[PDB]
Design a protein around this nucleic acid. Structure first.
Lengths: 97, 104, 422, 411, 78, 90, 96, 108, 99, 84
DNA sequence: TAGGGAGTAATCCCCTTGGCGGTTAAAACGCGGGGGACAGCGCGTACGTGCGTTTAAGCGGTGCTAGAGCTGTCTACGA
DNA sequence: TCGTAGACAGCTCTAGCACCGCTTAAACGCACGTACGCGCTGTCCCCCGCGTTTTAACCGCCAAGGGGATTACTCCCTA
């Protein structure tokens, strides 16, 4: 009975998914959430879904750059356990605050 | 008969010059300015087409894809330096193997 | 280990130089220089291995001061000299790794053998005419992995949550400290929570916060307005049957068991459970019974109150519930509103606690260990006047020429030469 | 009395798994001729005073302080050897089996050649001074260093106790430990791996790192090839040592020693050895007293003690007279000094690269002039050394020096 | 429904982030900053979408929104 | 409209052995519109700055060297001036 | 041959005296505010140019400038600026 | 024609209409601009600057200094929500800093 | 004595003192010499505005202030007193002038 | 008039220290120092380059604060007060 | 295709570029030196990960109302 | 200041939501395994501060000057 040792799997997922461009969360809960936030000011918002995928890719790539900066915070700590302190640090040094 | 022929350019000086007529950036249009503009556009066009051919032959493919263009972004950092927050549809990133994350 | 010389080496492992683990005798036979000594599992810390090629190295730590006494005292004889660690070596031509990995589950089942064993009294069931028997109740902590459902049955010195399985969770009245009733007044659950005084053994574990809710939620994955009539009518009929259950257990408890009403007038979204949900007071408690777990505090054993981090742009600050019992550990409530600060302050003034803030923080369990050195002696050492401020050893401010220069800019009298346009 | 009841197959446990021998008996004494060493042991009618019947065998307690652990005797040998004893010895072989309790509460008692750890009138060992290698004390853990005689079986190496710190007492026989003689004295040398400052004293066949917390021995097995390295500004002279075997700390090893010495570590060094004695000992490389530094005359001494030449450092200057530049590798800024047979790093950690392992070097070409080129190396053993953040005027010279060493290039 | 993003999709993002040991409070932090960036782009695009006198939302609103904040995408028009 | 006809023609001139995706052409016309309007707006600014009415290659060159200084800019200026001179010859 | 230098200083100078007569001034602050207003004027005017191109409109109403404000800067104070500007527009467009 | 009356007063304001109309003709922002729209702009900017100078005079009164220093302006721009967020990239000539103080940097 | 204080508490008083203040810290003459130096290192024929010099000193010390906040806010997460360039590397990295 | 040298190295330690104390930095190893000399400086060279790109466009030997303004707004490094 | 736009010509004029004789004040060196910075124990408590199932997605197909695209005719407000 | 740029009234188009249905997969989760963050401990260590010198930043005043602000003809460009 084998139980795969972690980290090398994460290396393969770095080599695969940081290379790849595909969606991680599935499309339909995403789109439901898109129209869910869209209703907050106005009704009747028909969506050319190409724009929705475009903003999906844009926000996810923003998240990925944020993950990079958060991992920069982690290695600055010389640690591996992640804190939202570090995330807001990445915000304010990014220039959000 | 077009000005792209007199300038020896590939890009339409008529179309760019009409969009400058629909531009109203200044009072009048010195006719050498859209010539110089389309020349620099053809320059950077052939530049990025050579970069795309190099990224395609480094990945052994033929169809131009934005993954090759994203390799040109992430690997030729002049492009990412000029286009910092400007992003690319279906590009990915480098799987950037850092030193500490490797064993030993 | 062995208290018998006839408890011998069952195999003399001096004949093999083979290490051996013996869980059935709760010991381990180790060749200590040709002396295959048995060793108690309760005399050993742990073991690990280092590879260098063939001749690996094994450290074996033992229970000693610095390892089990400290240098706790479940073996309080430190001046009797112990062993700290030993170190074996073995090449590779082994079985030592195999006997090495056994110590893990040996200590697992050995501390399982060291069980903690609060089993309540068997409740006398009273199936009478005045028996408040309330169906459709959801226990949390659940017995199975699913949400267990059942039916609560009230008696003279206990309740009887008869499960769907029929498991009669008996909730003694001398067990409950804080009975809670969150209504469904806009809520998604309407709970009969019964904070006990005992961690009672049921389901799999020993529980004190046990709640009995009924989820009546709305949006899930599966102009007329009659489904909202259905929703209002079913919420109201269920909640008024629950009020009947309240006034019938008050005909059985005789108004002795407080269904402590949520003081949602002083409500806020705090987080001592580190999940911001509806926090509002009750009789002697702040509560978060709208989720799991419900928050139970005792206002009565509180010496005083220190608010933490009351400082600019700290909307989500904390507060030290300085208890009378410093063995009772102190929670720091995240997300305390600056708006809800002063009403809870004057509510603490109604708890006879003068409102005392602060910004600074420290290890609070360290301060617990500091005040149990001397309770009134720490009070001599400033005490909780330490929470504010009490003199220093420095100057002050003392500035110099902090003023506007006479030659500084002042474009007052600009010009009168002015006109309009064409 | 009886002549012999001979054994040729029974153990005497002599410091670990020490196998069988030859237990002959004589008419006054008891003869052990080992099957590995051949040393003749005689325990006579006046020496044998007790034999412990523990698991069984004649664990013979003489009044020597010595424990002759004869072993491999069944319960039937409890009397038929005692019938051997019944003329003059008449020995009451005690049944115990003193400590099966598995329980550690007992007393450490210094024996004169032995040491007891008594558990309720029944100790667990009396392992002799002859069967210990070294013994230091501690606080509150006395370090007993049993350096085993290279046994491939289960081999006990280090033992330590909870010993209260000689509370109204002293290290009696612990002070009566073995002498591991100092010749030359190198105190308070500043070491980077480990970070701090320690001490060194030179013994005739090895050395001792002295200090406060992590301070050990330096066998000449450890030194294998002298590594002399300058500084890029020559205000220092690094001195990195291939500690092979690595000495340890209690958690990890010490694979390579970095010594940060300035150019001003300048003192004459007294090798306390005669000129006629070093021509015997050092093969004409030192005499007694040559002036120098804590680098130069030190490395003269070190070349003498390794009796081995120098892997020459990189005398190839990269740019502006520097030996190299600091660079980022393994999240450490340090100096990549080339070698005659490889490379060496400083200061985290002591990464020694060989030339006869490098399959090729390979390039990760960066962009900005503020150190973006990256210079990795794949060796034939798979050990990749991926050096990051290199300049341009320096990397272009590194390129020429790598092609001078013919280390192949992938891109 | 902020929990429409699954924690495994977040782990997918985080190994696409290349980030290893992840606290539970990381997830809702990221959900909040997600909603921030989200709602800013939504607010601006919806604002011009109302100003563009239309209901059906195209990608030119995305172009103009990402333009103004400089979060501009290539591939679609500009 | 698009320059995708002209971009595809320049593609099949300088790399005829090269297929293309539609998103690649979208990338192409994307930075065409982007950098075109960047240069156009900065040249409009510089037409406003030094009290200028019509625009020539001097201001465009200056806007380039503001935006991108370097040697790619040098060869861009070289190609632009020689194309202007070729236009000037007739 | 006149060539008079031009700014906007006496306006805000007088409004400064409208709400703080006692408070003095620096020409330092005058440079601050002139640089500020030329900045914000440029920003909103260029965004109006952008969006008039985006709406494909030869004209720019104050619908355009109102959404350029509200897009370019949020706030209830921005809505109050909308209120004041709508007031003055209904003023002058009524020829009052 | 008649006297060139102040259209600033026809907006109830300080600001000139035809001057800013000349400015929009100069900036080449469009072919044309609706007539109340630059007046709307000037009124909005007047309200904005009014909020600014009001809070600046408030902070100067907090300093009790009539003559304006740029530290009045500095703590004015620092001590806001909305325009503080809006005006981030701008610094002030002789501005000063936020004198931040850390008690974690202070010993006990 | 001469009474040595806490080495930094007086400097803390100085930090609190000067952060109240708004003035320059770079003296004009080597600064202007640097301006002439580096400007002529690009290109000769330098007639200068001193207004340009003062605006440059404002801009460069503002960039210094950006570096100071980046430094000290990394020093928040450094949990250290002595300063590392790594802080500034991450400062430029998250700043994005080089990454 | 003078050889263009030794003035960035002419920048003294305690001036930098004063800057870091209004910067609020508490204790510093110098090795930061020369690091800073290069980075701010280059950025300065950058905007001087930009100023050169203006001033060569401006047809002058005179250098104004106007080009500083155009640079700093094109930097994102915005400043008021000195609006010329 | 004509009338506004950029350039060469003349006259004068403000800033600073250089620099010395003074002024005073910021900074480096010598040295104590201590409060702060950084590497092993140690452990346990939060984080990574096999099997069951539990339920979400959306395509295989079709309807559809309505916001949007295209066409004809038209009127008032900044230039 | 006039005339055309959207505006208004129609004419016609196709797209995501609604609907029925079932397979395939994302993910909770539960206990098991795990590994390093923080506190303790110890071991240093490099600018802070005090004395002291010491050498450089800066005003007065001189001394002109030179490229630029200002205004006049004159030939040149484009929707």
């Amino acid at each position: 009975p084998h139980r795969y040792r972690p980290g090398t799997v994460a290396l393969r997922e770095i080599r695969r998914y940081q290379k790849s461009t595909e969606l991680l969360i599935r499309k339909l809960p995403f789109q439901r959430l898109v129209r869910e936030i869209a209703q907050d000011f106005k009704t009747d918002l028909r969506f050319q879904s190409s724009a929705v995928m475009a903003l999906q890719e844009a926000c996810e790539a923003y998240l990925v750059g944020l993950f990079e900066d958060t991992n920069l915070c982690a290695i600055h700590a010389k640690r591996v356990t992640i804190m939202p302190k570090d995330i807001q640090l990445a915000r304010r040094i990014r220039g959000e605050r | 008969k077009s000005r792209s022929s007199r300038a020896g350019l590939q890009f339409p000086v008529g179309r760019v010059h009409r969009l400058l007529r629909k531009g109203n950036y200044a009072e009048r249009v010195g006719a050498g300015a859209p010539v110089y503009l389309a020349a620099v556009l053809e320059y950077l066009t052939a530049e990025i087409l050579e970069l795309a051919g190099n990224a395609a032959r480094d990945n052994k493919k033929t169809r131009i894809i934005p993954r090759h263009l994203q390799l040109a972004i992430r690997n030729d950092e002049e492009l990412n330096k000029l286009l910092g927050r400007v992003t690319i549809a279906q590009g990915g990133v480098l799987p950037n193997i850092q030193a500490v994350l490797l064993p030993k | 280990s062995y208290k018998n010389p006839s408890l011998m080496p069952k195999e003399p492992h001096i004949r093999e130089m083979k290490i051996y683990i013996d869980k059935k005798y709760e010991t381990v036979i180790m060749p200590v220089f040709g002396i295959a000594t048995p060793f108690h599992i309760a005399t050993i810390k742990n073991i690990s291995m280092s590879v260098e090629g063939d001749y690996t190295y094994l450290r074996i730590n033992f229970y000693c001061p610095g390892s089990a006494l400290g240098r706790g005292n479940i073996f309080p004889n430190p001046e009797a000299t112990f062993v700290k660690e030993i170190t074996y070596r073995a090449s590779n031509i082994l079985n030592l790794q195999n006997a090495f990995r056994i110590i893990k589950e040996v200590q697992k089942r050995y501390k399982x053998x060291x069980x903690x064993x609060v089993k309540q009294d068997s409740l006398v069931i009273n199936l009478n005419r005045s028996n408040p028997k309330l169906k459709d109740l959801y226990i949390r902590p659940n017995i199975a992995q699913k949400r267990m459902q059942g039916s609560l049955e009230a008696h003279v010195n206990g309740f009887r949550f008869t499960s769907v399985r029929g498991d009669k969770v008996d909730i003694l009245y001398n067990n409950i400290k804080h009975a809670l009733f969150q209504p469904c007044d806009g809520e998604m659950i309407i709970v009969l929570h019964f904070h006990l005084k005992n961690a009672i053994m049921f389901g799999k574990k020993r529980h004190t916060d046990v709640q009995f809710y009924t989820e009546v939620g709305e949006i899930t994955t599966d102009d007329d307005l009659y489904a909202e009539q259905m929703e209002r009518e079913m919420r109201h009929k269920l909640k008024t049957a629950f009020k009947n259950f309240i006034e019938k257990v008050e005909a059985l408890t005789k108004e002795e068991l407080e269904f402590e009403v949520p003081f949602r007038d002083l409500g806020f979204n705090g987080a001592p459970y580190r999940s911001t949900c509806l926090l509002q007071p009750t009789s002697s408690a702040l509560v978060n019974a709208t989720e799991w777990p419900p928050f139970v505090v005792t206002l009565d054993e509180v010496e005083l109150i220190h608010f933490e981090r009351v400082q600019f742009h700290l909307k989500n600050f904390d507060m030290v519930i300085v208890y009378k019992d410093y063995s009772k550990k102190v929670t720091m409530i995240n997300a305390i509103p600056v708006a809800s600060l002063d009403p809870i302050k004057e509510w603490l003034n109604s708890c006879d606690l003068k409102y005392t803030e602060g910004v600074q923080s420290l290890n609070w369990t360290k301060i617990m260990k500091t005040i149990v050195d001397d309770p009134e002696g720490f009070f001599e050492q400033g005490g909780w006047s330490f929470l504010x401020x009490x003199x220093x050893x420095x100057x002050x401010x003392x500035x110099x020429x902090x003023x506007x220069x006479x030659x500084x800019x002042x474009x007052x009298x600009x010009x009168x030469x002015x006109x309009x346009x064409x | 009395m009886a002549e012999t009841l001979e054994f040729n197959d029974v153990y005497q446990e002599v410091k670990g798994s020490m196998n069988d021998g030859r237990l002959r008996l004589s008419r006054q004494g008891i003869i052990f001729k080992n099957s590995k060493t051949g040393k003749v042991d005689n325990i006579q009618a006046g020496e044998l005073t007790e034999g412990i019947w523990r698991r069984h065998g004649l664990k013979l307690l003489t009044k020597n302080g010595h424990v002759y652990k004869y072993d491999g005797f069944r319960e039937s040998e409890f009397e038929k050897l005692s019938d051997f004893f019944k003329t003059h010895y008449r020995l009451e072989l005690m049944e115990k089996d003193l400590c099966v309790k598995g329980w550690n509460w007992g007393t450490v008692k210094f024996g004169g050649q032995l040491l007891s750890f008594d558990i309720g009138d029944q100790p667990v060992f009396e392992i002799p001074l002859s069967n210990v290698s070294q013994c230091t004390t501690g606080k509150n853990e006395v370090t007993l260093e049993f350096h085993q005689n290279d046994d491939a079986e289960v081999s006990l190496m280090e033992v330590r106790f909870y010993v209260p710190p000689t509370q109204x007492x002293x290290x009696x026989x612990x002070x009566x430990x073995x002498x591991x003689d100092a010749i030359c004295i190198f105190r308070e040398l500043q070491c980077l791996t480990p970070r701090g400052r320690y001490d060194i004293r030179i013994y005739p066949t090895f050395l001792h790192l002295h200090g406060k917390t992590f301070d050990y021995k330096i066998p000449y097995t450890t030194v294998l090839r002298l590594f002399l390295l300058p500084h890029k500004d020559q205000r220092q002279m690094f001195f990195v040592i291939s500690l092979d075997p690595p000495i340890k700390q209690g958690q990890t090893r010490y694979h390579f020693l970095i010594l940060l010495f300035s150019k001003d570590e300048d003192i004459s060094l007294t090798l306390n050895m005669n000129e006629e004695e070093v021509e015997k000992r050092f093969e004409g490389r030192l005499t007694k007293n040559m002036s120098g530094s804590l680098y130069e005359m030190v490395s003269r001494v070190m070349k003498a003690l390794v009796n081995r030449k120098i892997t020459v450092p990189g005398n190839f200057q990269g740019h502006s007279g520097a030996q190299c530049i600091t660079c980022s590798y393994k999240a450490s800024s340090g100096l990549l000094y080339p070698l005659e047979r490889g490379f060496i790093y400083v200061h985290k950690p002591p990464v020694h690269i060989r030339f006869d392992e490098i399959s090729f070097v390979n390039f990760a070409r960066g962009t900005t002039t503020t150190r973006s080129f990256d210079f990795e190396i794949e060796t034939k053993q798979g050990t990749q050394y991926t050096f990051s953040s290199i300049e341009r005027e320096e990397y272009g010279k590194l390129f020429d020096f790598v092609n001078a060493k013919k280390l192949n290039i992938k891109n | 429904n902020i929990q429409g993003i699954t924690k495994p999709a977040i782990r997918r993002l985080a190994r696409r982030g290349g980030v290893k040991r992840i606290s539970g409070l990381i997830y809702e932090e990221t959900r909040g900053v997600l909603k921030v960036f989200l709602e800013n782009v939504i607010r601006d695009a919806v604002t011009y979408t109302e100003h563009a006198k239309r209901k059906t939302v195209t990608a030119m609103d995305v172009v103009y929104a990402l333009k103004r904040q400089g979060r501009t995408l290539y591939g679609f028009g500009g | 409209e698009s320059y995708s006809v002209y971009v595809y023609k320049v593609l099949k001139q300088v790399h005829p052995d090269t297929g293309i995706s539609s998103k690649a052409m979208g990338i192409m016309n994307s930075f065409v519109n982007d950098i075109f309007e960047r240069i156009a707006g900065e040249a409009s600014r510089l037409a406003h700055y030094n009290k200028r009415s019509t625009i020539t290659s001097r201001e465009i060159q200056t806007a380039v060297r503001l935006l991108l200084p370097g040697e790619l800019a040098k060869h861009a200026v070289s190609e632009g001036t020689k194309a202007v001179t070729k236009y000037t010859s007739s």
